[PDB]
Each structure stands twice: as C-alpha cells, then as structure tokens.
Design a protein around this ligand. Structure first.
Ligand SMILES: *[C@@H]1O[C@H](CO)[C@@H](O[C@@H]2O[C@H](CO)[C@@H](O[C@@H]3O[C@H](CO[C@H]4O[C@H](CO)[C@@H](O)[C@H](O)[C@@H]4O)[C@@H](O)[C@H](O[C@H]4O[C@H](CO)[C@@H](O)[C@H](O)[C@@H]4O)[C@@H]3O)[C@H](O)[C@H]2NC(C)=O)[C@H](O)[C@H]1NC(C)=O
Ligand SMILES: *[C@@H]1O[C@H](CO)[C@@H](O[C@@H]2O[C@H](CO)[C@@H](O[C@@H]3O[C@H](CO[C@H]4O[C@H](CO)[C@@H](O)[C@H](O)[C@@H]4O)[C@@H](O)[C@H](O[C@H]4O[C@H](CO)[C@@H](O)[C@H](O)[C@@H]4O)[C@@H]3O)[C@H](O)[C@H]2NC(C)=O)[C@H](O)[C@H]1NC(C)=O
Ligand SMILES: *[C@@H]1O[C@H](CO)[C@@H](O[C@@H]2O[C@H](CO)[C@@H](O[C@@H]3O[C@H](CO)[C@@H](O)[C@H](O)[C@@H]3O)[C@H](O)[C@H]2NC(C)=O)[C@H](O)[C@H]1NC(C)=O
Ligand SMILES: *[C@@H]1O[C@H](CO)[C@@H](O[C@@H]2O[C@H](CO)[C@@H](O[C@@H]3O[C@H](CO)[C@@H](O)[C@H](O)[C@@H]3O)[C@H](O)[C@H]2NC(C)=O)[C@H](O)[C@H]1NC(C)=O
Ligand SMILES: *[C@@H]1O[C@H](CO)[C@@H](O[C@@H]2O[C@H](CO)[C@@H](O[C@@H]3O[C@H](CO)[C@@H](O)[C@H](O)[C@@H]3O)[C@H](O)[C@H]2NC(C)=O)[C@H](O)[C@H]1NC(C)=O
Ligand SMILES: *[C@@H]1O[C@H](CO)[C@@H](O)[C@H](O)[C@H]1NC(C)=O
Ligand SMILES: *[C@@H]1O[C@H](CO)[C@@H](O)[C@H](O)[C@H]1NC(C)=O
Lengths: 126, 466, 466, 126, 466, 126
C-alpha cells in the first residue's frame, strides 16, 4: 500500500503500478445539511458512472491498463519513448498532452470500437 | 524503434484545482450531551477522522491563502449554524416596553455600567399584567425617543429587529472542526516552513481532513490558534498597499487572563405561555471592573520581535504601534466571547509607546513583574456577524466568569499616507471575520482528481482474442 | 437463408410516453440582482440552455394539448414559488384595527374611489400606541359590522385570513422560464404548422428544453405570448360543447397601452419590533381614472378575422361578440399585473356590437383614428390563485406607473343555448389559470426513452473464443 | 455528431450505427426544490444501473450490439430479414415485438447464460 | 486428490444482522381523502405491498423482541407524524385568559364534571373585544393562581406550553402500516408458534413488508391487535425481576364497548385575523357517565386462563389480580382514543379479587349475564407522549360518540416484594408506549444481505482464453 | 422461481444455481420523509457499486460464478471437498471462513489480477 496519490511525484513507469490503490477510493460515502451530503454523494457516483460508461464505449470496460489499435500522430506528441515512461510524471505529461483530449476520444469511439463491432458481427455471422 | 499506440489508464495520479462542497466532521464526544452546540452542531458528523497524512515528495505547486474558497465555505457554514441554532428560541418581543430606570445600588456603592429598570409584563394570563425589574448594562439601553421624564428608557433593538434569547442548552463552545473533502477530491497541505501565503510550495502532503480548526471570533488579537513552528511570520495580500490587513503568527503564545469580579445572581421573568427567559439579578459586594491581564515581560518581547520582522519588509526605518483608529466599541475594541459573556476590552493601553523593534533587542529581558491591565465594557444585545444573521440576546451567567487563552496572532494595518520620514506605524483593526479562518486555512487546498489518461506505448493492438 | 437468433442492442432509438419532473432552467442574468423573483426565484436554475432543436423526420405521432401534464407541472410550480416568495414577509395582523374613513381631498376636489382612513398602531414600544392615516381604494375596504357611525370601516381580509405584504425586493417580473427534461427523457415539439391542439402531428423535432415561457397572468385577453405564425388558430377540447373554453391565437398582435394618471407618494407605517410596511400617501394634481387604450383601427380587423375563422366551424350563421356574462370584478374583468400594481379593467366597451366577420371583410380598411378606451379599477388586497395560496397585499408604487403589451390571444366561450337561428354569439371568460400555460405548451410532449431492444439476425452464436 | 434520437426515422440497419451517440445521454446531471434534482437524478442513475445489470445477466456487459445463442420462435415474429432491417424503424419494430419481451428475457437469463456458465466452470475444471 | 483454488460468487445467500431505515408503506385507499392523518400521514407511501411470504426451511436463528430496533424506529416515526400534523394548526395562545366559571345547569339538574366558563376574546378587530362562553371538563381547568374568588379559573396548560388545536381535516384513525426493507435488506418472520420472545426460532420465513400494524395507544388493556394463534402467551425480558413488564397475548379476544351518552353541540369561537377554534356547547337531556362494558363470563374465563399460564412460570402458588398501583389518572387508568374523544377509564372494578386460576377451571362456565361496567373521565388538553411532543387540544365531537373494540392483550407486572407465601399478585401498569409496538413486532428481524463470497474448488485457473 | 433467498437452507452446490434471482433484487427503488428515501437509495446504490468495482479489481467483472489462479492454504480451511459443496449452506460456510476475508481479497488484487494484466501488456507488445 503506497497510499492514495502516493506516487504523484514518480515516473509514469512506476506510478502505473498503483492504479487499483487509487481507483478503489473514487467511490466513497430541522436540517439542510442532509441535502449537502446527498448532493455531494450523488455527484460523486454520477462522475464515476460517466467514467465507466466512457471506458465501455472505447472497449476497455473492466481493464485499468488497456491497449487499443489507434496509432499515434506525431503532432499530438513526438518525444522519444524513454522521455515519457522512464523520465516524467503523469501530472507533468497531462499538462503536455491536454490539447489532444476530445480529439483522441472521437477517434476511439467511432473510429475504433464501433468499427470493431461492425466487423465482429460480420464474423459471428459465420 | 516501433510504432506507438493509444493506451488507456484508469486511476492515474493527476488533479485539477476546483471548488466543492466540504464535509464537517468532529471529535465524536460532544453529541452524547451537547445538543445544538452553536458552533459545530450535530450537523457536523461525529466521525473523529484520523490525521492520515501522506507526504507526496518530488511534487511542487502554487498555493494561495487570499483566494482560497475554504474560507468562504467556513463563513457561510458558521452563519448557517448560528441562524439555525437561534431560530427555535424565545423572542424578546413582549419585553419591548417603557422601561423606567434608576441606579443599581450595592452596599452603598453605585455600579457605573449597570442601570436598574422597572418594566411591565403579562403573567401567563393575557389579561393580567404585573410590574417587575432587572438590571441592564448601559450599552443595551437607550433613552425613550422623547425624554418626557429623563428616567424613561427602552431596550436598544426595538427600532431595528426582535432579538432571540440564546437557549440555555445551546452553548458557544469553540470545539474543533475537521473539514474533509468528499470522494474523488483530496486535500493538499503545504508543509514547507515559512510559506508566506502565496507562491510555489516545495513540499506538499495529502490529508483526508484538516487539523482541528477552532471557530474563534475575536477581533484585534486572534485566540487559541496554531503557532508558526519555526519563526514569527507576516502574511498580507500586498504589503505596499496599506488597505490590506496584515495577519501575524506568533512563534510563542502570550497567556492572557480575562476575568470579571462581581458576584451576581440570575433571575427569571416570563411573558408568554411555554417558557424560560433569563434576566439579571441582585448583587453581593465588592466592586471591580471586568478586566484582562497580559504579562508585560512576554508582551514587550513579542512586539519587539514583530518589529524586527516588519523591518525586514520595511527597511532602515523605525516602527511604532498605536491605538485603533475610531468608530464604535464594536470595531475599536477587542470583541471576545469568554465563558458565555461578550467582553469588549479596550486596547489603547497595549498597542502603545513603542520604538524601533531592532533597537529594543537591547532590552529583551526582565525579572518577572506586573501585568498590563485592560478595562472592559460588557453587553448582552448582540448583532454578531457585523450586521448579518439574527439579533441575539445572551442570557447572564451567574458568579464564576473567568477564562484563560493564548494570543497566537494579530490583525494589523499600516498607518495612513504621511511623509513616513525615518518611521512607519501600525494599528490593530478587526476587519471581516474571515481572517479568523485564514489564520488557520492558509496552508491548504482542495483538488479534484481526473483519473482517465491516454499515452503512447509499443503495445501494438488488442489483436482479436490475443 | 438461415436460422435466426436473438441479438441485443443497447441505446436503441425508441420511446414510451410518461409523466416526470421537469427542471426549471432560466436565463442566467436575473439572480445577479433579482433575489427571489415571484416567478422563477433562484430555485429555478440559472443556465441559459442552448436551443439545440433537432428535426427527426419520417416520424408522426399523437400530440394532445388538453390532457398534457406539463400544464399541471407549471400550475403547481407557480403556486409553490408564490408561497416561498410570500413566507419571509410582514404579516398585516396588527393592522386589523377599527379604521375611521373620510374623503380624500386634492386640489379641493374629491378623489373617485380612494377613502382616507385614520387608524391606530403601536410604536416600536408595545405600551405606546399612536394615531396615523393612509389612503385605501374602496374595494380593499368594507363597512364595520353595523353603521352605528357610518365612517367606521375595516380592511377587507380580516373575517377570512391574514395577508402578507409582498417584500419590496421580490419583484413580479414575468421573466422567461425554460422547462427541461431530466436524463433518459426527451421533449418533442410539433412543428406541423396549423396543428389545432390534438391528433397525429406529421413533423416532429426534439429539444432539450422548451422556448422561454413567460408566466403572464391575465384573464380575458392573453398578454405577451407567441403568435400563430401561419394564420389565426382556434383551439378547444370540443367546439360543439359550448362549455369548453376556446383559446384563440392571433397572427399579428394588437398593441395595448395600460396606464395611470395620478401623482402619488408612498408612506411607511409600523406596528412592531422591527419591520417596514408601506401605505399610500398624499397627491399632486391633474386627475383622470386609470385606463387602457386599444387602437380601433387594429382591433376591428382582429375581431373581423377571428370571426371568419370561427365561421369555418359555425357555417352559414352571423357571429356576434358580447359582454362577459356575470359575477364579481374578479371574473367579469380583464385582470393584470402592470408595473407592480393589480389593475382590473372593464371590457364591456370592447366585446360589443359586432356583425358578421365575413361581411365586415367588405369594410376592412380605414385611416388611423381614436383609441377604444377601457376604464380600470385598482386594488391591493389580493386572493391571487382564485383563493388558493395565501392572501397578499401589494404595496403602492410611487408616481410613474405605465406599461405596454401585445395582445396575442383571447379566452372565449360560445353564448348559451338560445334558439341560435341564423346566428351565434361569443363572450370572453377567465376560467382557471391553466389556459395561460396551454396557450404556450400546446405543441409539446415529454417522452421516456426505452433504450434496450431485441431482434432476429443470422449472427449464429457467441461461439466460444471466436 | 448524428444527434440524440437523430436516427429515429431511419431503417434499423441505419439507426443501429448511432448507439454510442444516444447511450452517452442516458446518464447526465431555504428551499426544498433541490429535492426535484436529487429525486430525478437518483431515479435516472437507478434506471441506467438496472439496464447494465440486466445486460450482465444476459452476458452482453460492455457491448452495445451483442449476439446470443437463443433461436427465434415464429410465434414472436415471422417476417423476412430485409422486411425488418432494410424496411422499418426500431420504433415501429418495437410495437410489433412488444408482446414477447419478458418471454425472451426469461429464456436468455437461465436457458442461456446460466447454462453457458455451468459449462465454463466444468471446462476450467481441467 | 486435486489442487484447490479461490473461486468467487456474487449474489450468494448470506446475511448479517444490522440496523437500517425502513420504508413506511400503507394501504393505498386512505390518501385519496384522509390528508395528514395524525398517525400515518401521506408521508407514508401508498405502495400497498402484497404479502409475498417465502418459507426458507432448514434454517434456524436467534430472534429477540426486547433488543429489537424496529420498535425504536416506530417510536421515532409516530412522534414525528404527530408533530408534523400539529405544526400547521391553530394555536390557543390568545385563549389563555381569566375564565369566570359557574355550574353547567341542564334540564332540572347539573352535569357532574363540566363547568360553564365565560371569557373574553377579540372579534376580527384587534381593538374590539367581546364576551362569550364554553363548557370545559374539570380536568382541563384549574383555579386561578391566587384564590381571591372561588369562581376565577384558567385553562390548565398556560404555565407550561401553548396547545395547538388538532385540525378537523387531520384525523386520529388507526390505519394499517406495513414496514418494508430498503434494497439489500430482508425482513424475517419467526413462524415457530409458541416462541416466547427470545432465542433460536426453529422455522423462519422472508417477507418484503410486515403485516398491517395499527398504531393504537392504550395503557392497561391493548386494543385491536393480532391474537396468539395457538395458545395464550406470556412475554417478559426477565419474569423473576418484578419491575419488568409482562405483556400477555390472548387467543380469543374480549369484545369491549366504549360509549358516551350525552347529547352535545359544538360551538365556534375566534380571537383573530381568520381561523376557527372549536368549543363545547349546550345540551339536551338524559344523564349518564361516559362508560365501557365488558362481558362478565368472557372476562372471568380470560383472567382464569392467564392464571394457569402464569402458574406454569410460578408453581405451587395462587395468583391474584389487583388494582393499578397509584398516582394520577394519566398512568392509573386505561387511556384511549375512541371516535376522536380521549377517554380515561377506571379499572379498579375489573382487575379484582380473583382466586387460583387453575382451581377456577372448575367453574369456567355461565349462562348469558350482566356487563362489568367501567366509569370514565374525559379530557381535551393532552400532553400525549408522556411529556414529549407538543401539547394538543382535541376539539369536541357533536353527539354520537361510541366505539367497539377487541381486547387482544394485557400489560401486567407482578406486585412488590411481599411475603409471597402460597400467593403472588399482579397489577395493570402502562409503562412506555413502545410496548404497544412490541405486542405486534415481536416475531420480526431486519437482516442485511452480504452477497459476495469465496470458496475452494478444482477449477484450476482462468487459463488464458480457455 | 425459488425466490429471493429461497435457497438459504440448501447446500452450496444447490444454492449456487440461483444467483441471478437474488442479484436482480440487490438494487431497487411540508415533509422531510423524502430524505429517508434518498439516503436509503443512495446508500443501496453505493453498496452495489462497491461490489461491482471490487469484482472489477479481482478480474471477474460481468460474471457471477468466477474462477481465479490463487491456490488454497490449509490454514484458511482444509476439509474434504464434499464436506464443502455437497454438505453445508453458504450461511454456514460464511461463519467458518470469515477470518480469511481481507486476507484473500488483498491476495487477489496485486498478487493476481494486477500481475495477470502486467503480463498481458508485456505480451500484446509482441
Ligand atoms: C408585457 O411585456 C412588456 C415588455 O415587453 C412589459 O412592459 C415592461 O414592464 C416592466 C415592469 O414589468 C417595465 O420596467 C420598469 O421600467 C421603469 C422605467 O424604466 C426606463 O427608465 C429608466 C430610467 O428612469 C431606464 O434606466 C430604463 O432603462 C428604462 O428606459 C423602471 O423605473 C422600473 O424599475 C424597477 O424595476 C427594475 C426591474 O425591471 C428594478 O431593477 C428597479 O430597481 C425598479 O424597482 C422597471 O424597470 C418596462 O418599462 C415595461 N416596458 C414597456 C415598454 O412598457 C409588460 O409588463 C408585460 N405585460 C405584463 C402583463 O406584464
Ligand atoms: C378498534 O377497531 C374498530 C374497528 O374495527 C374501531 O371502531 C370504529 O372506529 C371508527 C372511527 O375511528 C368509526 O368510524 C366512524 O363511524 C361513524 C358512523 O359510520 C356508520 O354510520 C354511517 C351512517 O350514519 C354510515 O355512512 C357508515 O357507513 C357507517 O355504517 C362515521 O360517521 C364517522 O365518520 C367520520 O370519520 C370518517 C373517517 O372514518 C370521515 O371520513 C367522515 O367525514 C367523518 O368525519 C366514522 O367513519 C367506526 O364506526 C367504528 N366501528 C365500530 C363498530 O365501533 C375502534 O375505534 C378501534 N379502537 C380504537 C381504540 O381506536
Ligand atoms: C484608548 O486611549 C485613549 C487615549 O488616552 C483614550 O481616550 C482619551 O484620549 C485623550 C487624548 O486624545 C486623553 O487625553 C486628555 O485627557 C484629559 C483629562 O482631563 C482631557 O481634559 C483632554 O480633553 C483629553 O481627553 C483622555 O485621557 C483619554 N480618555 C480616557 C478615558 O482615557 C481611550 O479612552 C482609550 N480607549 C477606550 C476604548 O477607552
Ligand atoms: C359594461 O357595459 C354595461 C352595459 O352598458 C355597463 O352596465 C350598465 O348597463 C345598463 C344597461 O343594462 C346601462 O343602462 C341604464 O343606465 C341608467 C343610468 O341612469 C339606469 O337607470 C338603468 O337602470 C340602466 O343601468 C348602464 O348605463 C350601464 N352602466 C354603466 C356605468 O355604463 C357596465 O357598467 C360595463 N361594465 C363595467 C364593469 O363597468
Ligand atoms: C378503584 O377502586 C378503589 C377501591 O374501592 C376506589 O378508591 C376508594 O377506596 C377506599 C378503600 O381503600 C374506599 O373506602 C373508604 O370510603 C370512605 C368514603 O366516605 C372514605 O372515608 C374512606 O377513607 C375510604 O376511602 C373508597 O370508598 C373508594 N372510593 C370510591 C370513590 O369508590 C377508587 O375510586 C377506584 N378508582 C377510581 C379511579 O375511581
Ligand atoms: C400483442 O399482439 C397483438 C397482435 O399483433 C397486438 O394487437 C397487441 O397490441 C400486442 N400487445 C403487446 C403488449 O405488444
Ligand atoms: C476466527 O476463527 C475463530 C475460531 O473459529 C472464531 O472464534 C473467530 O470469531 C473467527 N473470527 C472471524 C473474524 O471470523
């Protein structure tokens, strides 16, 4: 147990070993203070379900570390592979890749996993 | 080497700084007995959360105490707990009548601060009224709109609002609050020594909840706080603009004793039918003012040291501390709440007569000696949150009022725009009550975790069934 | 071809019709200043929802305006916001004393319908009453039980309830409201123009939220609505049953100027611990009754066109418009809410004397001319929702009351079942307040998505590992 | 972006391409008016989780188009394959098939995926 | 044999014993008209759940009626619904005035315990008071605090609280309540008849919701409950500790008639802006005490049978029933809520002078015979939940008050620490209202399902793609 | 239909046929009594999601009966296999094994399913 966020200073190649430890704590839980606690807890459950729905659309559902068939475009980033995994933190990488969020998601939704499902139905057709 | 592919990670350590609701949690032990404590009612959860601190290391990020939303979250919570705690209680509406008042006499003395007022009430029976009397402090009383007879007087509130009496079970106890961030957020502490309110903090730790905040309201000296553990520290949003308050933290507390000596009896009066109302009663005699004692030895050293610290921002000039500027006692005196009485103590005896803090290091010692002594006004009719929230009447306390506290920080401003030749000057001023929270929530932040991430690696594909 | 197998789809486009909560989204700009508007308080979510209309096409389904539940969602919501808006305010209980009322005098004349009432109040001191006076309109006043002295009167409400004054901050502004569906529900517009309230709409579009509805209350003409963009339209649940209200929509609005001329001063009176209550004052003079102007040039054509349209349901017979049939001013007059005053205007001058709308097309042309002028009563003690919810007192407004509106629709019924030989007749009527909502929500439905589905196809099996 | 319900007039063979577009909108979000938001949001989340649990019992969890081994009964429907997929809308087909909901689910739950799971455990026995 | 491996199951049948909220379901038919019943307002849900009882079999587990939480859940609910139902209603605060009370003369006689009080009220005009009169029962009235005049009296509540009138629309009906488990919990019944409140129940069944509990209040006999289906049953947390209450269940109920005979008129009185309060009126004459009738034969046999069942716990001694111990009518008498009047009936005529229940099985038979008859007090000012919850005034009911009920159980205790030689004695006593719930809920438990589980089996691995 | 908990007295080898019938009912749903319904429902949803997330971390997401590669320790329990499956109720087994909850869960997380998914990513590297 390294603890929640306990690898935020570590290189991506080390921090990517902790994912269960952190994910397992994204889901927790005369007066109006009952409305505060409900309105926090329902929003926390809504955010978790929005993530799990989005992983299912990409085809990753249930996996934490997940592979996909979408290739990289050198415009999104192009630094050598060791300058990522062996060298810098997920938080520092986030502030580099942040433009290409949404661009990569539409490429995953339709332009991979819908197409995989079209071809899969045409295989199990036999 | 090889082609690179989008690979997905869930639960990645990354965060964005954002606003949220915060949970109030407490030491468990109050709500066994202490139903509706005015500060931290049982609306705060009795969790008693463990301070599970976790040093992150290799991370550095910007903090800011002045823009911090936790301060505003605390202010809107404290006012809500106050108003909700008064709303059940007895309203001093039927008490608002022609008071006829004369001197409070005790063992041939006359009490200077207190008048003795006859007034009329209903008994429980609507069509049977009676005369009775209670002592009121002069600040709660004002002469009737026309003085037809000069002994005609009224309770002060009636040309503004109806005050609730603060119920006998509903204590002002400043019990510790722990603030906790909800699921999928985290609280970050700056653990860098001498962090001066803004900038990149070099050493950051996660916690689930804050340390024990005490929600203490006092308006020229701060009370019962947490010390700056290495040095005296000065914080302000812009020291060159004199309008910005200058919060100071002490490395060592100065022990203040605040006291009353009177012996006094507590009296019950009714105008209604379902009830307890409390009013002030008859006295046993020696006569002394409400006062506070501060040790000269400790205080002199303290204002000496703060003068050195201010000189490191204000170079090659002498410093003097001086009286609060002006206005009413509500801003020009140390508001307090001790033991259930609202003291209002003068400080012009205390922020006085002081020369260059660096040169005063030549003194810096004494054999232990006499106290600085403060005179105090007391009052019962209170408009607590600087004009917002309900009017409150605080019921009198019998006999043994005394409390002991630690001065841990000060609320200064610089003086007005003089020639400033060889000299600068500073004055106590209470400002908005938020600074009683910023002098604890300075080293803190709430962050939102964003657990989805995408990255390149040589994992070629999720090849079909592989 | 081959055997067929159960295959399963999620997120399928299909729906069932069902009842639900709707969200009250709003224009975001209001709650910066307008704390608790009477209609859409900040309990309605500042949002400014984008009108993301999407045309479906090849879909055709049964709309119905008369059975529509969104009308009842609005009816209960508007009542709920009214009660939340009144509950904080001053109750006129202590004002229900004997009033002694004589004439109001201005420029040595007597005012038409305002009596000048002297009465008594407590000061802020319970055992010190005083005398003072205010003007009241005759409809807010009634003689006390017997005329032992004819000048004894009371405020109308007291033998029924206790009225809250409307707080000065809490405006009557009819700001736009957007109704929005929660997740898994969708809102359908009928875009098939000339849809007449029920049946298969041949052209349907989705929206997340309705157009901005103004919650405008008036009881004979409808004010500031949406026009019928193709042609005039006549709607009722059954036109043959004369007891069903006929909602008409106009293609071109008629501009109505509603006005006062008096110059008037506002007075503050108290009976208390502190609160303020607002009362009517002394006058500056040139005098005419409060009134509204409708241009004959426009109105003539408008009742002519509507007559032609009614003749396509009432063939080979002449149509006449006539007076509202009977009852008190609360039903027989055009109610209002202009500029913060509650007007009640006579319409027997307007729905009059009018011959066959088809034959009047032979006229249908004029130079510009005088206004039809309507005389108006005003009153301040109000039982707004036809006795549902609390009694309200509207405070008087200083000086410059005037407003300008568009007539967009009418509320009619046919006349009674007389011989009706060669002729038919129509009258304005108020009914229940719901028809001020049906005259906007007529082209709407809410539907629940049912996103699971099963279907046959030749996909043989989920063959193990394939 | 083809739009939420934007295919409701299309043939099933076309509308079945838009499932991600629609599914992403099944899950979103001094006074008691806050009870409207909380009671609506909790019911919306409860309906979504009932759908996901129901797909998991059938064995389709994390798919949108899913294929199962239950054969058709001509009593449920008997029209030609193109007279479904190339010819009518999901909204029209629903009002043909709506009798045999419950019947098809009871047949999927036990009499398919429970039995697939009995056999999987008896295979992994080795 | 073979290697064994961790295998995982979800939805396993297993549970832990734990506390929770329970849903309050109802018969659907009340909330069509019965808006805010004093017990079971429409805060309880019109779900009308079918009793889907499932026998488990092969399972045995420890029920306990005394440590049960569903009783406390019901106690906190019934208090909440009582307070919720009174908070909107008229407050008798302005009625607390000097009452001049003379005799209640009716038709050549005088009523025994009613006095005829004259008192002062306002009209709807604050400054116009009037005189009027109402009859009050002597228990609601007390001599005015100084005995200057033997005709000056006050309403009883005034020195302790202001009683709300129970609104006429807010009825006292004992409608059936079904308690339901939230999701992830199950309710268990003990179907093992002759189970005596604690220990291993040998035969257990699941339900979604309890049988229809009636929230009835009476304090010596129980009313309208469920019978013990096999035999008479005795329950107590410790029978040898004489301070522990001894709930008894009957196998055959005794029919009780409780009645009034007077003819009586209802009067409406006001002190206000508008409201109505209801007060007691003038009478038409034949005169009897309000009373209750019990069959001597049925009662005699019933107390005989209970003596045999108690002799099996207390062998070789003779058991005698006796009077309630002492104190005021609120505990020494059989309380009630019949028809909307709060009866208080003496029982020292009923628990009397009885020999050995075993030897009395010799007698045990009679022909048709006279009633035992109980004299009753009635009162209207009520402190219902043994001081807690608001004071209530029950408005009087015109004319035809009478009701018929079933005795289903008794609330005994053994007598004090006597010589006990050849003998033991038992007394009726009322205790806490919780026992009126334990005398239905004794055979229930709520359990929390824990659906995950792990177990060894020969399934070797999830070999990749196998 | 045996019903909800209808097998609680049956042997583990017979109760484990009914898992869908029970699991379909782990999820269902002037005044403050609405705060009972909201605080009950959001807790019942939150408990259910904590089970589903925990099944995701162990590698079983979407299965009811599931198998893992962790071998048994005789310290946890050591009886003959028929004395488990053919012989005792899940309710009785739960009271035998309850010490080794949290021991087995922490062993399934890192020391099995993270490690399987490490080796999967090192394999799809090709
Ligand atoms: C049908 O729809 C029309 C609009 O299309 C409505 O008519 C308007 O009604 C509102 C009130 O409901 C009127 O607003 C008031 O106007 C007064 C004059 O404003 C002018 O003059 C000032 C300077 O004197 C300028 O600054 C301003 O820009 C304008 O040119 C104001 O004195 C009033 O002030 C009060 O209300 C505001 C909020 O609006 C508060 O912030 C203030 O503190 C103050 O309390 C007010 O603004 C408006 O003038 C009307 N327009 C016309 C053209 O008539 C009808 O009301 C509607 N029909 C029905 C049945 O409601
Ligand atoms: C133990 O359980 C028994 C029943 O099993 C209870 O006895 C009943 O108590 C209720 C009141 O709680 C009694 O109901 C009242 O009956 C009046 C007479 O009704 C009969 O006669 C009229 C014609 O005059 C017929 O229309 C009617 O069908 C009946 O045949 C009614 O006048 C009363 O009306 C008032 O209350 C109702 C709600 O009940 C309102 O809707 C009305 O507007 C009105 O305000 C009322 O219905 C009933 O008669 C009792 N039955 C018997 C046989 O006694 C015991 O009360 C209970 N024990 C305890 C301690 O509560
Ligand atoms: C805080 O200290 C001030 C400064 O001493 C107190 O106010 C009054 O201030 C004046 C100077 O501005 C003092 O000096 C003079 O006193 C003589 C007395 O005869 C008088 O004739 C002069 O007109 C002038 O006032 C004055 O002594 C001082 N008053 C008192 C009562 O000390 C102030 O009182 C202190 N603060 C509080 C809240 O009391
Ligand atoms: C709406 O118009 C009607 C019709 O004019 C107004 O009511 C009154 O109607 C009668 C005819 O039925 C009018 O004629 C007669 O007037 C003389 C006046 O001396 C009187 O003696 C007759 O008994 C009869 O009333 C009458 O003039 C007319 N009243 C007025 C004031 O016009 C009605 O007033 C209009 N509605 C409103 C709300 O004003
Ligand atoms: C329940 O029954 C008791 C027992 O009869 C009633 O209380 C009173 O009990 C005493 C004996 O302990 C009775 O005898 C004597 O009566 C004369 C009357 O002048 C008196 O001077 C003696 O001091 C003694 O009390 C007494 O008659 C009897 N009282 C009545 C009214 O019968 C009791 O009344 C019954 N409970 C209720 C609530 O009525
Ligand atoms: C069942 O089938 C008949 C004949 O096609 C149809 O009329 C009826 O509406 C269907 N009912 C349902 C529940 O789908
Ligand atoms: C562990 O095992 C012992 C012996 O069976 C038992 O007494 C104890 O309660 C068990 N503890 C748990 C947590 O299962």
């Amino acid at each position: 147990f390294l603890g929640f966020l306990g690898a935020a200073g570590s290189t991506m190649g080390a921090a990517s070993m902790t994912l269960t430890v952190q994910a397992r704590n994204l889901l927790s839980g005369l007066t109006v203070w009952g409305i505060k606690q409900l309105q926090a807890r329902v929003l926390a459950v809504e955010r978790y379900l929005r993530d799990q729905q989005l992983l299912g659309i990409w085809g990753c559902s249930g996996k934490l570390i997940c592979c996909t068939n979408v290739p990289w475009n050198s415009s999104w980033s192009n630094r050598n592979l060791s300058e990522i995994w062996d060298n810098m933190t997920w938080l520092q990488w986030d502030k580099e890749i942040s433009n290409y969020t949404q661009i990569i998601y539409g490429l995953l939704e339709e332009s991979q996993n819908q197409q995989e499902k079209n071809e899969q139905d045409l295989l199990a057709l036999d | 080497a090889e082609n690179l592919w989008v690979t997905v990670y869930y639960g990645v350590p990354v965060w964005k700084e954002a606003k949220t609701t915060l949970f109030c949690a407490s030491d468990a032990r109050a709500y066994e007995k202490e139903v509706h404590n005015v500060w931290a009612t049982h609306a705060c959860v009795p969790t008693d959360p463990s301070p599970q601190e976790l040093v992150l290391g290799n991370v550095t990020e910007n903090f800011n105490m002045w823009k911090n939303d936790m301060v505003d979250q605390m202010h809107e919570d404290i006012i809500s707990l106050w108003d909700q705690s008064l709303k059940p209680c007895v309203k001093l509406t039927p008490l608002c009548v022609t008071l006829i008042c004369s001197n409070a006499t005790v063992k041939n003395g006359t009490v200077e601060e207190m008048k003795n007022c006859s007034f009329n009430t209903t008994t429980e029976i609507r069509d049977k009224e009676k005369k009775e009397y209670a002592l009121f402090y002069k600040p709660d009383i004002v002469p009737l709109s026309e003085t037809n007879n000069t002994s005609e007087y009224r309770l002060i509130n009636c040309n503004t609002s109806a005050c609730t009496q603060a119920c006998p079970k509903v204590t002002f106890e400043p019990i510790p609050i722990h603030y906790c961030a909800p699921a999928g957020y985290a609280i970050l502490k700056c653990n860098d020594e001498t962090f001066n309110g803004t900038g990149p903090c070099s050493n950051v730790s996660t916690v689930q909840c804050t340390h024990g905040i005490r929600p203490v309201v006092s308006t020229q000296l701060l009370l019962n706080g947490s010390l700056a553990e290495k040095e005296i520290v000065i914080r302000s949003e812009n020291l060159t603009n004199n309008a910005k308050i200058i919060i100071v933290h002490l490395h060592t507390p100065v022990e203040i004793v605040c006291t009353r000596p009177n012996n006094n009896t507590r009296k019950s009066v009714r105008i209604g039918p379902g009830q307890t109302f409390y009013a002030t009663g008859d006295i046993i005699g020696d006569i002394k003012q409400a006062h506070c004692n501060i040790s000269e030895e400790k205080w002199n050293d303290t204002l000496q040291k703060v003068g050195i610290e201010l000189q490191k921002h204000f170079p090659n000039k002498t410093i003097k501390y001086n009286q609060s500027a002006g206005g009413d006692m509500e801003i020009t005196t140390h508001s307090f709440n001790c033991g259930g009485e609202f003291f209002y103590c003068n400080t012009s005896n205390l922020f006085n007569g002081t020369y260059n803090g660096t040169y005063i290091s030549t003194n810096s010692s004494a054999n232990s000696t006499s106290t600085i002594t403060l005179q105090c006004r007391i009052k019962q009719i209170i408009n607590m949150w600087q004009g917002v929230g309900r009017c409150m009447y605080a019921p009198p306390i019998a006999g043994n009022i005394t409390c002991r506290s630690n001065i841990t920080g000060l609320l200064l401003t610089r003086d007005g725009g003089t020639n400033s030749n060889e000299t600068e000057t500073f004055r106590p001023a209470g400002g908005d009550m938020r600074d009683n929270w910023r002098s604890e929530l300075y080293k803190y932040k709430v962050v939102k975790i964003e657990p989805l991430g995408v990255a390149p690696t040589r994992c070629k594909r999720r090849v079909v069934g592989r």
